[PDB]
Amino acid sequence: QIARLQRQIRALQRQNARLQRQIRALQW
Amino acid sequence: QIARLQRQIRALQRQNARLQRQIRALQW
Ligand SMILES: [Cl-]
Ligand SMILES: [Cl-]
Ligand SMILES: [Cl-]
Ligand SMILES: [Cl-]
Ligand SMILES: [Cl-]
Structure with a gap:
């Protein structure tokens, strides 16, 4: 389990x- | 620990x- x-x-x-990468790409 | x-x-x-909710909002 560990x-x-x-x-x-x-x-x-x-x-x-x-995901952070995606958000940065999507933000205008 | 576990x-x-x-x-x-x-x-x-x-x-x-x-983050995924924000991505969904920004998608076309
Ligand atoms: Cl990473
Ligand atoms: Cl990657
Ligand atoms: Cl930027
Ligand atoms: Cl850690
Ligand atoms: Cl434990």
Whole structure:
């Protein structure tokens, strides 16, 4: 469980960054 | 440790859902 949770956090953090990137691109 | 991980996942999930709502609003 520890490994699964740590991997999930790092995946979510990568997704977070990808979303911020998208928002910056979309904002005029 | 496990419950700390689980709380960090829930916070990231909340953050990302907030960003995804903003993205949806900006899409054509
Ligand atoms: Cl961290
Ligand atoms: Cl990243
Ligand atoms: Cl990327
Ligand atoms: Cl910019
Ligand atoms: Cl524990």
